[PDB]
Design a protein around this ligand. Structure first.
Ligand SMILES: [Mg+2]
Ligand SMILES: [Mg+2]
Ligand SMILES: [Mg+2]
Ligand SMILES: [Mg+2]
Ligand SMILES: [Mg+2]
Ligand SMILES: [Mg+2]
Ligand SMILES: [Mg+2]
Ligand SMILES: [Mg+2]
Ligand SMILES: [Mg+2]
Ligand SMILES: [Mg+2]
Ligand SMILES: [Mg+2]
Ligand SMILES: [Mg+2]
Ligand SMILES: [Mg+2]
Ligand SMILES: [Mg+2]
Ligand SMILES: [Mg+2]
Ligand SMILES: [Mg+2]
Ligand SMILES: [Mg+2]
Ligand SMILES: [Mg+2]
Ligand SMILES: [Mg+2]
Ligand SMILES: [Mg+2]
Ligand SMILES: [Mg+2]
Ligand SMILES: [Mg+2]
Ligand SMILES: [Mg+2]
Ligand SMILES: [Mg+2]
Ligand SMILES: [Mg+2]
Ligand SMILES: [Mg+2]
Ligand SMILES: [Mg+2]
Ligand SMILES: [Mg+2]
Ligand SMILES: [Mg+2]
Ligand SMILES: [Mg+2]
Ligand SMILES: [Mg+2]
Ligand SMILES: [Mg+2]
Ligand SMILES: [Mg+2]
Ligand SMILES: [Mg+2]
Ligand SMILES: [Mg+2]
Ligand SMILES: [Mg+2]
Ligand SMILES: [Mg+2]
Ligand SMILES: [Mg+2]
Ligand SMILES: [Mg+2]
Ligand SMILES: [Mg+2]
Ligand SMILES: [Mg+2]
Ligand SMILES: [Mg+2]
Ligand SMILES: [Mg+2]
Ligand SMILES: [Mg+2]
Ligand SMILES: [Mg+2]
Ligand SMILES: [Mg+2]
Ligand SMILES: [Mg+2]
Ligand SMILES: [Mg+2]
Ligand SMILES: [Mg+2]
Ligand SMILES: [Mg+2]
Ligand SMILES: [Mg+2]
Ligand SMILES: [Mg+2]
Ligand SMILES: [Mg+2]
Ligand SMILES: [Mg+2]
Ligand SMILES: [Mg+2]
Ligand SMILES: [Mg+2]
Ligand SMILES: [Mg+2]
Ligand SMILES: [Mg+2]
Ligand SMILES: [Mg+2]
Ligand SMILES: [Mg+2]
Ligand SMILES: [Mg+2]
Ligand SMILES: [Mg+2]
Ligand SMILES: [Mg+2]
Ligand SMILES: [Mg+2]
Ligand SMILES: [Mg+2]
Ligand SMILES: [Mg+2]
Ligand SMILES: [Mg+2]
Ligand SMILES: [Mg+2]
Ligand SMILES: [Mg+2]
Ligand SMILES: [Mg+2]
Ligand SMILES: [Mg+2]
Ligand SMILES: [Mg+2]
Ligand SMILES: [Mg+2]
Ligand SMILES: [Mg+2]
Ligand SMILES: [Mg+2]
Ligand SMILES: [Mg+2]
Ligand SMILES: [Mg+2]
Ligand SMILES: [Mg+2]
Ligand SMILES: [Mg+2]
Ligand SMILES: [Mg+2]
Ligand SMILES: [Mg+2]
Ligand SMILES: [Mg+2]
Ligand SMILES: [Mg+2]
Ligand SMILES: [Mg+2]
Ligand SMILES: [Mg+2]
Ligand SMILES: [Mg+2]
Ligand SMILES: [Mg+2]
Ligand SMILES: [Mg+2]
Ligand SMILES: [Mg+2]
Ligand SMILES: [Mg+2]
Ligand SMILES: [Mg+2]
Ligand SMILES: [Mg+2]
Ligand SMILES: [Mg+2]
Ligand SMILES: [Mg+2]
Ligand SMILES: [Mg+2]
Ligand SMILES: [Mg+2]
Ligand SMILES: [Mg+2]
Ligand SMILES: [Mg+2]
Ligand SMILES: [Mg+2]
Ligand SMILES: [Mg+2]
Ligand SMILES: [Mg+2]
Ligand SMILES: [Mg+2]
Ligand SMILES: [Mg+2]
Ligand SMILES: [Mg+2]
Ligand SMILES: [Mg+2]
Ligand SMILES: [Mg+2]
Ligand SMILES: [Mg+2]
Ligand SMILES: [Mg+2]
Ligand SMILES: [Mg+2]
Ligand SMILES: [Mg+2]
Ligand SMILES: [Mg+2]
Ligand SMILES: [Mg+2]
Ligand SMILES: [Mg+2]
Ligand SMILES: [Mg+2]
Ligand SMILES: [Mg+2]
Ligand SMILES: [Mg+2]
Ligand SMILES: [Mg+2]
Ligand SMILES: [Mg+2]
Ligand SMILES: [Mg+2]
Ligand SMILES: [Mg+2]
Ligand SMILES: [Mg+2]
Ligand SMILES: [Mg+2]
Ligand SMILES: [Mg+2]
Ligand SMILES: [Mg+2]
Ligand SMILES: [Mg+2]
Ligand SMILES: [Mg+2]
Ligand SMILES: [Mg+2]
Ligand SMILES: [Mg+2]
Ligand SMILES: [Mg+2]
Ligand SMILES: [Mg+2]
Ligand SMILES: [Mg+2]
Ligand SMILES: [Mg+2]
Ligand SMILES: [Mg+2]
Ligand SMILES: [Mg+2]
Ligand SMILES: [Mg+2]
Ligand SMILES: [Mg+2]
Ligand SMILES: [Mg+2]
Ligand SMILES: [Mg+2]
Ligand SMILES: [Mg+2]
Ligand SMILES: [Mg+2]
Ligand SMILES: [Mg+2]
Ligand SMILES: [Mg+2]
Ligand SMILES: [Mg+2]
Ligand SMILES: [Mg+2]
Ligand SMILES: [Mg+2]
Ligand SMILES: [Mg+2]
Ligand SMILES: [Mg+2]
Ligand SMILES: [Mg+2]
Ligand SMILES: [Mg+2]
Ligand SMILES: [Mg+2]
Ligand SMILES: [Mg+2]
Ligand SMILES: [Mg+2]
Ligand SMILES: [Mg+2]
Ligand SMILES: [Mg+2]
Ligand SMILES: [Mg+2]
Ligand SMILES: [Mg+2]
Ligand SMILES: [Mg+2]
Ligand SMILES: [Mg+2]
Ligand SMILES: [Mg+2]
Ligand SMILES: [Mg+2]
Ligand SMILES: [Mg+2]
Ligand SMILES: [Mg+2]
Ligand SMILES: [Mg+2]
Ligand SMILES: [Mg+2]
Ligand SMILES: [Mg+2]
Ligand SMILES: [Mg+2]
Ligand SMILES: [Mg+2]
Ligand SMILES: [Mg+2]
Ligand SMILES: [Mg+2]
Ligand SMILES: [Mg+2]
Ligand SMILES: [Mg+2]
Ligand SMILES: [Mg+2]
Ligand SMILES: [Mg+2]
Ligand SMILES: [Mg+2]
Ligand SMILES: [Mg+2]
Ligand SMILES: [Mg+2]
Ligand SMILES: [Mg+2]
Ligand SMILES: [Mg+2]
Ligand SMILES: [Mg+2]
Ligand SMILES: [Mg+2]
Ligand SMILES: [Mg+2]
Ligand SMILES: [Mg+2]
Ligand SMILES: [Mg+2]
Ligand SMILES: [Mg+2]
Ligand SMILES: [Mg+2]
Ligand SMILES: [Mg+2]
Ligand SMILES: [Mg+2]
Ligand SMILES: [Mg+2]
Ligand SMILES: [Mg+2]
Ligand SMILES: [Mg+2]
Ligand SMILES: [Mg+2]
Ligand SMILES: [Mg+2]
Ligand SMILES: [Mg+2]
Ligand SMILES: [Mg+2]
Ligand SMILES: [Mg+2]
Ligand SMILES: [Mg+2]
Ligand SMILES: [Mg+2]
Ligand SMILES: [Mg+2]
Ligand SMILES: [Mg+2]
Ligand SMILES: [Mg+2]
Lengths: 52, 122, 204, 117, 137
RNA sequence: GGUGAAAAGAACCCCGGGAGGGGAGUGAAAUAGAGCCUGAAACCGUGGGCUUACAAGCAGUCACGGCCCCGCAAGGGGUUGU
RNA sequence: CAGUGGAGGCCCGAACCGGUGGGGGAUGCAAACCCCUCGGAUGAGCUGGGGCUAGGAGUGAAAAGCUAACCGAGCCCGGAGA
RNA sequence: GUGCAAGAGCACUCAGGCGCGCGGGAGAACCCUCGCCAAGGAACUCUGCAAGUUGGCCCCGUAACUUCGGGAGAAGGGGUGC
RNA sequence: ACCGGAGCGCUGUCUCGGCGAGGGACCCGGUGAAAUUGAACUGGCCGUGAAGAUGCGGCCUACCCGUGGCAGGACGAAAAGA
RNA sequence: GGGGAGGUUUGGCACCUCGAUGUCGGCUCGUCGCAUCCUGGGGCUGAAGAAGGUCCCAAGGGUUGGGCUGUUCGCCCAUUAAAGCGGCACGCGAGCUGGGUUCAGAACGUCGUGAGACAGUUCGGUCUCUAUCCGCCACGGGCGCAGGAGGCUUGAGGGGGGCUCUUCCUAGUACGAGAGGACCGGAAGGGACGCACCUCUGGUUUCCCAGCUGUCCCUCCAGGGGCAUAAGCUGGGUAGCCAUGUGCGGAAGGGAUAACCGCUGAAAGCAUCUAAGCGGGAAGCCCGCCCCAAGAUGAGGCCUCCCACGGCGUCAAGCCGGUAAGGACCCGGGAAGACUACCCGGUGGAUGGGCCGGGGGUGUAAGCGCCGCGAGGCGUUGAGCCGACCGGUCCCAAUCGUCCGAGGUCU
């Protein structure tokens, strides 16, 4: 409400544009020794267990 | 390090007891004055009917400092109080017998008059 | 135009003849020439000096061929030294005689996003009478409707340090070939471990 | 910037300190404690000192560990079962394992502090 | 390269061992290679040691003394080529590492505050005169 | 304020904790399914066509060219490179 | 003169009443707040409950202050589509 | 409740009650709140604004001026633990 | 707790800043506002124009899109100028 | 007495702006003009020398601290090489202040019968967390760069820096009656400023060590913990970050010029620095130093590594998959860092944590023995505890693994 205030409604174009790098990135997973199940690297996992 | 408002003890018998610095005499804008530096200074208190009275603006030369002076030989030296001696425009002490130690630095400056009268040239 | 790579190893003081001297210790290990570039093959004169040893496995790169092209143990780093074609196959601290003055390039310490006071030794603001909002601020930054913009290169807060910095005319003190050590007049860019080059100064 | 220094910690001091103590207590009570990755990595080194210290024996070393762990019984257990098990295993008396779970709500990455065996 | 330490220590051959032990709170006088107008002399400096600033080599220490009503303090690099002969003169109860508190009360209270470390005193005079007789015969 | 002619208001199965869907079923019609006729516009989204990372702009207009689209061609539609 | 005595719009200081100076807060925790600091603190003291006085009117140690979060004349209808 | 000259003050703590209904990390600038600093000691500034100094009790001791009550906690100093 | 002048004490007020602590800022997960808003594809200089231009002329510069940060412009917002 | 430039003053006009363009000073940050205060160059001098006068050339840089006032200005103290003057909305209040002035309160003088009034005075008196765009400082993601990849580079273009004094040697020589006192060339020290650094000096160092009060607790004694801040207080402190501390910079040098000095030299037999031509000459210009830098789409160079087609479009431009060199993810982590980026490492490994040693800090743990009624003291003891620094050691932790990435158009 105070000093700084948007001078113009940002166009839908210029809006979407800013949300360019906004996109998500898929997780990283790898098959385990136990199940064929996919574990995230450097981790344990439920319904699979582990060693040592 | 001595600067504008700094009070100095008087090392000699000039009659003055304490002078506040007034200006460090050196470059066009020297920030501080250490041992062996000459400074203008007002007398802020003095013994009765001494050689120099209160309010007398005088020139003086630092002989002792509270901030330690670094020696080229890596050595250092520090006193308990900041003191100085009043001098002539001829750069010679207005008073005689000047008591209290002094730095060796006064020697390389041409103040042998002082180091001679000084008891402990430390 | 002498030259040689090294690493800042640390710094302490020694005693010259009878006065103390603060000195930095650099380590310019044997640098193998890897490629001399002439005006014919390139367009300037210079030499590629390698440095630290390397696990031959880590250098699986095409660099293996570049190393083989000169037949040298895989080094870790290598930079050029303009206008300087030596002799033999390796330069050493032997290049520098005590008394000679050198220029040392290095990478200053990384201070990251530093304030303006920090970066440009600005004044900031008053701690007392004024608003408790601009204590370390740059204050003004321009004029009015004219120019109505901000001068390129205006000093402002930002990433600072961690960059190429060259200090000059450092006099070389006692240089120990026995261990590839090299003493200098103290102040030399970078942290204790940073690669630094040591060149010939310009006094005349 | 000035991270040129050892480790890192959240909360203030008296807090974080009691935090290390409270984790250690539990960790020496259960042997296997699940907690956030960071908290774990720090707690890791804290306990190892308590173990290697209990690895000694003199009552000085006992009283020393008494400052952090307050339960006389727990420390009793440390000098009896815990320490010997780790005889001859100089250093690394503890393990940390990245969990694949993420706490719902704050999305915190979990991990596991296991007394090695 | 895993020698960063030893390397700095290699440069340190400027070392010296002729110098005696001495812990803060005990007077000591050093002969210093002071240069006069152009010649050389040995100015003596009798006083209490207030600070020993250990840091391997270039480990310094400081000495404070009263000198005609004025207090003075000198900092000496331990392995300084200019230090001719550093002679102990009396040892006392430290009870503290850095002891500037003596700056505030330089008086007869300083004496009764810095006792005399009979322990080190015995070891000194004893190992001195006793090791003499062994070197003689 | 307004389902439908009628509640016929969606049994039973499947996913799901539920909500909500997917089949099945009613109905002429279910994008008439329950704040349910019709259901416009701003506004948000998915798919496709033309187009854009050396470029300067009240955003259009005039011209030529290229790509896609209706027609056999002549023609016309969309888009925008200069 | 000493003793006893225990006066005061007396002193220091919590509760309680208040708002000096500063900093914070300023789409606030908050349409007046928070922190540090500061005044009074047996009196012209503070406070609960029950009562009375109001719009050219009331109250007012007097600022045109207060009279239901804006008072040089309250608020709500109405003359009124002045 | 204990301690501190006393106390409803302050510190810690019973009984009782609570951790203030977003968390997890990181350890930039900058802001708030807070701690320390060589030498100097008001040079800062409209102003010592702010901050720091001093601080309780016990003893010594205390000026002009006065409406004889004051000024006075004047000032300045010493003691304080076991 | 009124307004001025001075001095002693003591001080980050200052010479002249430095480092440190904590709550924000910053990154990840949950929730998720506001004033403002002709439309925008919104660069510099020197002209110029209703006399202080991103939008006219001429020239110069400039790959597309963000994040952290600063306030010089948008005659910035706010309140139909007291 | 006459002509003009500038647009800093006072003012004239009333042109944008009254559905708002915040006013004077100060602070912070500057930047530009030259009509130059200093430093550099030079002409004339009523210029002996030194010092100075007036005029010319020249912004590169520099242009102090304080007393008084709200002041700008000015006066004054002390110094300096000098303490220049202007523009930028009398630059800068979405950067700060709010002392001045222009709200309400109050008062003096003054005016008015009065209510009130006064560029007359005096005390008091709310300066608004969130930046959308341009601009700016920084940091990334995308694509491009006529094959893909690793390392190293050139430097178009741009930025930073650019100050100055004092003493000494020449020589007490030239000049001068004396007092004074040089050119030119050379040496040493210093002021402010800038970049970098932690040896040293000096800071901080939030739990590294020690002491101390009150209280509550473990466990009665000893010993120890919590709280007194977000360290209860106090004494002291590594590494890191720092200035008060250390180093180093301004050049030298080459080239072209300014005012100005001059050679040869007509036009114009002489004369002239110029009309052809040539030489000298600045703290200034170009370059040289230092930093950025091939989005220099005009996408540059070098060195090295990998290299055919396996299936559709009939020439032509393309598309789908397994790959190569090589790269990314993921993890341990860093004097790198807001994020991302950058750099090192990932079992063929010392990257982090622990542990050992060293450095460092603290400054003689606890327990026992001994002396004293006791508080305590002495011994075992430089003990004990012990972050960050320099190393060492696979005890723990960087497991296992995945994805991507050309098949190189035409004359
Ligand atoms: Mg869209
Ligand atoms: Mg979209
Ligand atoms: Mg695993
Ligand atoms: Mg298993
Ligand atoms: Mg005094
Ligand atoms: Mg004078
Ligand atoms: Mg007088
Ligand atoms: Mg006078
Ligand atoms: Mg002093
Ligand atoms: Mg003598
Ligand atoms: Mg004598
Ligand atoms: Mg002497
Ligand atoms: Mg390489
Ligand atoms: Mg190069
Ligand atoms: Mg400041
Ligand atoms: Mg304010
Ligand atoms: Mg504010
Ligand atoms: Mg403009
Ligand atoms: Mg190091
Ligand atoms: Mg480090
Ligand atoms: Mg705690
Ligand atoms: Mg605490
Ligand atoms: Mg440890
Ligand atoms: Mg411990
Ligand atoms: Mg090293
Ligand atoms: Mg020796
Ligand atoms: Mg001799
Ligand atoms: Mg119907
Ligand atoms: Mg119905
Ligand atoms: Mg019905
Ligand atoms: Mg349903
Ligand atoms: Mg169906
Ligand atoms: Mg149907
Ligand atoms: Mg259906
Ligand atoms: Mg439809
Ligand atoms: Mg229908
Ligand atoms: Mg339905
Ligand atoms: Mg429903
Ligand atoms: Mg119908
Ligand atoms: Mg919508
Ligand atoms: Mg929406
Ligand atoms: Mg375009
Ligand atoms: Mg047909
Ligand atoms: Mg037709
Ligand atoms: Mg009586
Ligand atoms: Mg009474
Ligand atoms: Mg009475
Ligand atoms: Mg009173
Ligand atoms: Mg009292
Ligand atoms: Mg109450
Ligand atoms: Mg009241
Ligand atoms: Mg207040
Ligand atoms: Mg006020
Ligand atoms: Mg306030
Ligand atoms: Mg305020
Ligand atoms: Mg009464
Ligand atoms: Mg009464
Ligand atoms: Mg009442
Ligand atoms: Mg009553
Ligand atoms: Mg009441
Ligand atoms: Mg009532
Ligand atoms: Mg009532
Ligand atoms: Mg009425
Ligand atoms: Mg009335
Ligand atoms: Mg009345
Ligand atoms: Mg009402
Ligand atoms: Mg009201
Ligand atoms: Mg009326
Ligand atoms: Mg109403
Ligand atoms: Mg009517
Ligand atoms: Mg009580
Ligand atoms: Mg007591
Ligand atoms: Mg409390
Ligand atoms: Mg404190
Ligand atoms: Mg202190
Ligand atoms: Mg200080
Ligand atoms: Mg003073
Ligand atoms: Mg004074
Ligand atoms: Mg005053
Ligand atoms: Mg005050
Ligand atoms: Mg006291
Ligand atoms: Mg005190
Ligand atoms: Mg008096
Ligand atoms: Mg008293
Ligand atoms: Mg009292
Ligand atoms: Mg006292
Ligand atoms: Mg005492
Ligand atoms: Mg006044
Ligand atoms: Mg965020
Ligand atoms: Mg609104
Ligand atoms: Mg234009
Ligand atoms: Mg036009
Ligand atoms: Mg943008
Ligand atoms: Mg941006
Ligand atoms: Mg963000
Ligand atoms: Mg801002
Ligand atoms: Mg209106
Ligand atoms: Mg109007
Ligand atoms: Mg005229
Ligand atoms: Mg004008
Ligand atoms: Mg103008
Ligand atoms: Mg005008
Ligand atoms: Mg007109
Ligand atoms: Mg207006
Ligand atoms: Mg408007
Ligand atoms: Mg406005
Ligand atoms: Mg105005
Ligand atoms: Mg002024
Ligand atoms: Mg000129
Ligand atoms: Mg003139
Ligand atoms: Mg000169
Ligand atoms: Mg001449
Ligand atoms: Mg002249
Ligand atoms: Mg002359
Ligand atoms: Mg002359
Ligand atoms: Mg200038
Ligand atoms: Mg410049
Ligand atoms: Mg001045
Ligand atoms: Mg003034
Ligand atoms: Mg004033
Ligand atoms: Mg005036
Ligand atoms: Mg005057
Ligand atoms: Mg004056
Ligand atoms: Mg004068
Ligand atoms: Mg003078
Ligand atoms: Mg001026
Ligand atoms: Mg002018
Ligand atoms: Mg100006
Ligand atoms: Mg103007
Ligand atoms: Mg004007
Ligand atoms: Mg502005
Ligand atoms: Mg403002
Ligand atoms: Mg202003
Ligand atoms: Mg005012
Ligand atoms: Mg005010
Ligand atoms: Mg008027
Ligand atoms: Mg008048
Ligand atoms: Mg007047
Ligand atoms: Mg006046
Ligand atoms: Mg006033
Ligand atoms: Mg006023
Ligand atoms: Mg105010
Ligand atoms: Mg805020
Ligand atoms: Mg912000
Ligand atoms: Mg916008
Ligand atoms: Mg714009
Ligand atoms: Mg932009
Ligand atoms: Mg990029
Ligand atoms: Mg070039
Ligand atoms: Mg460019
Ligand atoms: Mg260039
Ligand atoms: Mg110069
Ligand atoms: Mg002569
Ligand atoms: Mg003559
Ligand atoms: Mg200290
Ligand atoms: Mg340190
Ligand atoms: Mg601790
Ligand atoms: Mg400890
Ligand atoms: Mg006990
Ligand atoms: Mg305790
Ligand atoms: Mg507690
Ligand atoms: Mg507890
Ligand atoms: Mg607390
Ligand atoms: Mg306190
Ligand atoms: Mg300390
Ligand atoms: Mg400096
Ligand atoms: Mg000339
Ligand atoms: Mg001439
Ligand atoms: Mg002729
Ligand atoms: Mg001629
Ligand atoms: Mg010519
Ligand atoms: Mg001519
Ligand atoms: Mg020439
Ligand atoms: Mg020339
Ligand atoms: Mg020149
Ligand atoms: Mg140039
Ligand atoms: Mg490059
Ligand atoms: Mg390229
Ligand atoms: Mg290239
Ligand atoms: Mg191959
Ligand atoms: Mg093949
Ligand atoms: Mg083949
Ligand atoms: Mg074939
Ligand atoms: Mg591969
Ligand atoms: Mg480590
Ligand atoms: Mg003992
Ligand atoms: Mg013991
Ligand atoms: Mg004990
Ligand atoms: Mg026994
Ligand atoms: Mg016995
Ligand atoms: Mg006894
Ligand atoms: Mg005992
Ligand atoms: Mg030790
Ligand atoms: Mg620890
Ligand atoms: Mg350790
Ligand atoms: Mg290391
Ligand atoms: Mg595979
Ligand atoms: Mg593929
Ligand atoms: Mg192709
Ligand atoms: Mg051809």
């Amino acid at each position: 409400a105070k000093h700084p205030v948007p001078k113009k409604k940002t166009s839908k174009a210029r809006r979407d544009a800013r949300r360019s790098h906004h996109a998500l990135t898929p997780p990283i997973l790898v098959p385990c020794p136990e199940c064929k199940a996919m574990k995230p690297p450097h981790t344990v996992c439920p319904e699979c267990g582990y060693y040592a | 390090m001595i600067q504008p408002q700094t009070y100095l003890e008087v090392a000699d018998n000039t009659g003055a007891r304490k002078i506040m610095c007034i200006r460090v005499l050196k470059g066009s804008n020297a920030k501080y004055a250490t041992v062996g530096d000459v400074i203008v200074a007002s007398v802020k208190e003095a013994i009765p009917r001494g050689a120099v009275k209160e309010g007398d603006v005088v020139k003086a030369v630092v002989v002792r400092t509270k901030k330690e002076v670094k020696r080229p030989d890596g050595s250092a030296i520090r006193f308990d109080d900041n003191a100085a001696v009043i001098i002539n425009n001829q750069l010679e002490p207005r008073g005689t017998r000047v008591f209290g130690p002094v730095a060796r630095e006064l020697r390389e400056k041409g103040f042998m008059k002082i180091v001679s009268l000084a008891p402990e040239v430390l | 135009m002498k030259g040689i790579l090294g690493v800042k190893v640390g710094m302490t003081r020694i005693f010259r003849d009878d006065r103390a001297v603060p000195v930095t210790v650099i380590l310019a290990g044997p640098c193998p020439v890897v490629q001399r570039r002439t005006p014919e093959k390139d367009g300037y004169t210079a030499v590629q000096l390698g440095f630290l040893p390397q696990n031959p496995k880590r250098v699986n790169r095409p660099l293996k061929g570049h190393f083989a092209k000169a037949g040298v143990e895989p080094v870790r780093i290598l930079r050029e030294i303009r206008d300087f074609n030596p002799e033999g196959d390796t330069v050493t601290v032997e290049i520098f005689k005590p008394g000679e003055r050198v220029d040392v390039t290095g990478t200053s310490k990384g201070r990251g996003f530093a304030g303006v006071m920090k970066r440009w030794n600005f004044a900031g603001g008053p701690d007392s009478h004024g608003a408790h909002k601009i204590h370390r601020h740059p204050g003004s930054i321009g004029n009015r409707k004219t120019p109505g913009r901000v001068y390129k290169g205006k000093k402002m807060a930002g990433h600072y340090g961690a960059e190429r910095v060259t200090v000059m005319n450092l006099e070389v003190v006692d240089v120990i070939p026995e261990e590839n050590l090299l003493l200098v007049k103290g102040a030399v860019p970078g942290p204790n471990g940073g690669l630094v080059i040591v060149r010939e100064t310009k006094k005349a | 910037r000035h991270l040129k220094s050892g480790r890192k910690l959240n909360r203030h001091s008296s807090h974080r300190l009691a935090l290390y103590r409270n984790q250690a207590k539990s960790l020496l009570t259960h042997g296997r404690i699940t907690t956030t990755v960071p908290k774990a990595k720090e707690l890791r080194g804290f306990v190892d000192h308590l173990i290697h210290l209990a690895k000694r024996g003199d009552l000085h070393a006992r009283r020393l560990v008494l400052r952090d762990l307050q339960d006389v019984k727990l420390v009793r257990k440390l000098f009896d079962e815990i320490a010997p098990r780790y005889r001859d295993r100089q250093g690394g008396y503890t393990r940390v394992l990245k969990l694949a779970e993420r706490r719902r709500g704050d999305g915190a990455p979990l991990a596991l502090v296991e007394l090695v065996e | 390269m895993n020698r960063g330490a030893l390397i700095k220590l290699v440069e340190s051959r400027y070392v010296r061992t002729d110098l005696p032990e001495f812990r803060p709170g005990d007077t000591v006088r050093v002969s210093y290679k002071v240069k006069e107008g152009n010649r050389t002399r040995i100015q003596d400096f009798e006083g209490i040691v207030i600070r020993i600033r250990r840091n391997g080599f270039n480990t310094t220490f400081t000495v404070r003394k009263v000198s005609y009503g004025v207090g003075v303090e000198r900092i000496f690099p331990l392995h300084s080529p200019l230090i001719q002969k550093i002679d102990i003169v009396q040892r006392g109860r430290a009870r503290r590492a850095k002891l500037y508190f003596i700056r505030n009360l330089s008086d007869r209270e300083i004496r009764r505050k810095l006792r005399a470390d009979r322990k080190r005193i015995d070891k000194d005079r004893a190992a001195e005169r006793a090791a003499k007789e062994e070197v003689q015969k």
